[PDB]
């Protein structure tokens, strides 16, 4: 619980922003059938032209304002097209002779907008809100969206709008003001109303995840991170338990403990539990890789493209789990009991570190020969998975920035899911679809198993011959689940948004839909 | 014996060592071929060749004391199989007592004189016949010529290859008897127990090398040597940091600064009970993990995951202590040494550039923290020479360049004295652990001229590292016949993924024959 | 024999200097016994001191000029013998004539190494390079072998000679005061001959790849041959084809220059007691081919030297043709070609067929040297010789094993290896025996061809290459001197001509 | 042949064979000397 320091200027906690300006936005949904009042701030139309590639803008909604209706006549809109992500701003005086900002974002010519399409839309929309001072945004949907997509739009708008300034000091943005109201006009509004506060909770869970990932390793270490987890649980009324080193020793978690050996920070295993009142029908463990910094260890990340400067993100798995805990604790689903573990530690180079070649013993008795100290994630997960399984759970889903190979296989958009059970994997792909967090199913190729045969230990951590290292790492993890449906989502490739230089908070929504929709 | 420090309570605090191996339980019986072969229970294997005729037919020439077996093994049956080296076949038949017997052969090729590497091949074929077969007895019939040394080599290799190291197995049946039929059996009998000790010497070294670095660290390695000394009645001194500082071993101490394990310098001594006529110091590099230090092993092919093996020298030395302490050679005093430490990266580590003073007062400029073995050896050699021995022989996994010069099959021996070099080469022949004599080229010495220190640890121009390391080591032996055996290339068997325990037989043959 | 050109300004021959200033030096030897004169130019004393640092210089020889005052012990104590440290002074002598007088330090040891004598000569050459002198005389106040004296002379001439052929004065007299100067006189003309063989070899090596290419190299050797009256033959493509030299032809497929196989033969005056064939690697430029030398360390800029083996053979021919050893038939052979990247190049993966019928799977086109040597080695063997000795800048690995000073010799015959090691001793070109380790032979088992060119596992490249070559000598004693490491002088930026003397000494002694 | 459940279990041959010598060889007592570990093989020459 006390965070060690080397000098007194070392942070002793992760700064966390819970009441974000997004929380202060009053959101009202109205039915499009009754027309748009245009009286202040900015009114954006989401408009498409199904079929016509870059076809013209034509507003379909009744607008309850002579002047603004005039401005939006077809004649006046023809100079503009609907290319996905295109936008324009208009300035005019309404009937009340008040200055009024109106606009549109193009949603393209495919009537079925994909995750990535809606993301481009929200991105264009957020550029209209940055660098502007506005008290109210209203968005008019003149496109077809199902309920999940409408929610995803809101979650994404919120997330992308929010700016993380915890580490700015002399360079806080003088010019970040946030809207205070958000109006939404859509067909069958009443049916979309439910989605607003769900979006708001989903946004925070993901933003929360995002704040932990983005917190550098000198703020976010295994003690601060677990202290944050405890605080989160306390705010949500979750049972929690942080296992320290003496308990991890008693539990013989030697694989986990070896990874943290080199750290000035004691390993801390997060265990939070949410339990429904009433009948518990499903029991799920959600396991997040929580390496708070990954140097690689003695196999140091030294090679070009190893992105050591990014390795604060190696706890993204943990963060996703914890943002899930936020959503689950907030939405209080029925008939489930969820464990949200996290074998948190730091992978450092020290006199005390574990060394390539070390044979360590996992909590299930399996001896593992370490071939590369930068394959630490699977070691910590091995023990986390033994622990999960001993909880007598129906599903274990881990999520982990496990392998850079994910960038060569699926890249930056889609996470990969592996597992030992087709139904579980399909539930994950089912939640992938409803969270709009894209995952793709990848195989655990048993043929590669033999390459984890160690001469001296029960198993090798790494293949010295197979380069399909996301698969091998899955094979390894499979050895630590005896008899429970288990899946593994490898988010190494998708967790960090390279273009925007921040975390995606990837997983929270996926894990939440997974928990909710069971 | 010191306490092994731990970071976590799960950290092992000793090297597990198996002294009583299944090989020790094997009863070995040697029979002269002239009396004919009894072919009964177990598996009976003929070692057959056909000189001159490449892949020529199998002919079994020994008398077999069973009409059914003899019938099966007549030339007309056997000519359809060939002697290609390492080839093997199993036979099943009923002997004269209506009993099912398993017979076979291992082809030994078409060269009269099998080489160490050929014989390994034969042995490997033989061991695959022992694996996956619950046999109580193997009998092996020599129908090939071998001398005494090769015969012994056959048994050591058999024993060694047959034995499986399972100390580190958690979640994942040996023969009891071995018959050997060979001509002039009475002359070979004496190799049997010699082979048994050599096997264990090697196997013991191998257990230590294979022991991972969390198991086998300076404290637990030296503790293992103490224990070995106690079992064998050798004298022992383990020098710790305090005594090492007193001895001014700043080269050796520097390498270990960055480790959580205090340096421990192992000094085992075997003295003979009669008038001592030769004194010998055997010095092994003992780096229980070599991370490279600040010059971290990060480059492709640097093999940091194999670096537990950087104490192979020390292992060979200890395994030689085993063989010597067991065989009790006469008229000789042997000191077994090994400045043990671990080369780590830490706030406390020594740095590239550091200038450090050896126990002989020579200052050394460190060019590369990963050339640490020569520094620990420097002070070992100074220590060794202060013992006042006739010979100092070191054995070390010193230079990766060995893999580029002699490869993985022949270690390099350098020295300052030809007589001693020839004695090492002689020991190579008879131990059948192959060594090749490599030069200490004095022309490279100038590239060890340091602008600031007395000497550079490494050459900045000369890529011949093994030679340059040698040249460096030579600066630390003033007046004594000295040789240096670079086993970097040969210590670890890449195909079999295990250590060879290389050097143990070599060093033991050296001590015994001289 | 005409050299193809891309532009008219491409050289079409290798410039060679045969008549060097060094040939213009009149050499006389004198017994230190009779004391030393100081009539002219530069007089250097070679001095050491057992128990040094080095200690002071003390001259021991008596001098026939009251120069004697300079070299008295009060003034000489100010100077030390540290190896290669020198000083020289100008002054007037008993004639009021201008004399220059000095010393070179020879360390503490009274027996001197190949490499120390080098350091001695370099220091002496320094002095000659910056002084105009009609004469230099050298006084030996240190003991030296007949062989080492010669080596000193050879090294002096070679190090003193400068190669100016590509740039857009010397002493006319050398006097030497030794001791038993009768024992030595005879090393003089041998030295001079060995110097040229060496220097010549160095002219070929230093000749860039655009001057010295298979055709120019083959014309030069034919010209050399002509001057010595060696029998000569240059096999071109059509006869190399007839002869099915496919490994060799494959390597040159990529070059604009036709393969040229040099066969020079020195028939002997005597009774024919040993047919010997010297086979040099003649890659006039090695790009590496499709396995291009692109890796930091691969030294593409130096690969004009990859014919150093060939030059060493040729330079040896100079020495043999000149000194006229008796009872030996000698064949000077080199598969000359270029290793280039092209639409026409052989590729990684090609299965090529040597002239003995061995199919070879090319695993790396930069291992082209053993391929051409394979074909030459069969050709050599077909000659029915007693000894084959090849000499090649074959493997980068040499530098990691023996380095830049000693070359390694591998072989299939102990007594031949031994004749090479002893030539090493008396040539004072250091060579060390390295094993052909047969355990590694398996790594050459191709899955498709009869044999692999390279091993993919084993890193002991010099050893796998020897094992590869060994497959191409059936019945003849054979040794392979790998000079990759020793051939170029990296500190001095020039060929050593390594191997000429050693090969010559070899045919002279055995 | 396999041994379901028993990892590296003994070899047991069930087929009845038309030869009394091979029948003998294939008896359980002989075959249990061997195991079914994937890819592990043994084969013996005999007279029928
Ligand atoms: Zn890692
Ligand atoms: Zn990681
Ligand atoms: Zn090292
Ligand atoms: Zn080392
Ligand atoms: Zn090449
Ligand atoms: Zn080449």
PDB file of C-alpha atoms and ligand atoms in Angstrom, chain A residues 289 291 294 301 311 314 347 374-378 401-402, ligand 2:
ATOM      1  CA  UNK A 289      -1.863  -8.768 -18.023  1.00  0.00           C
ATOM      2  CA  UNK A 291       3.166  -5.439 -16.496  1.00  0.00           C
ATOM      3  CA  UNK A 294       8.247  -3.973 -19.697  1.00  0.00           C
ATOM      4  CA  UNK A 301      14.030  -4.316 -25.657  1.00  0.00           C
ATOM      5  CA  UNK A 311       6.008  -0.206 -22.549  1.00  0.00           C
ATOM      6  CA  UNK A 314       2.026  -3.445 -21.029  1.00  0.00           C
ATOM      7  CA  UNK A 347       9.810  -6.321 -15.734  1.00  0.00           C
ATOM      8  CA  UNK A 374      10.585 -10.446 -22.376  1.00  0.00           C
ATOM      9  CA  UNK A 375       8.098 -13.306 -22.648  1.00  0.00           C
ATOM     10  CA  UNK A 376       7.069 -12.341 -19.077  1.00  0.00           C
ATOM     11  CA  UNK A 377       3.400 -11.765 -19.811  1.00  0.00           C
ATOM     12  CA  UNK A 378       2.647 -15.420 -20.278  1.00  0.00           C
ATOM     13  CA  UNK A 401      -0.648  -7.030 -24.610  1.00  0.00           C
ATOM     14  CA  UNK A 402       1.135 -10.319 -25.151  1.00  0.00           C
TER      15      UNK A 402
HETATM   16 ZN1  LIG E   2       5.067  -7.798 -21.799  1.00  0.00          ZN
END
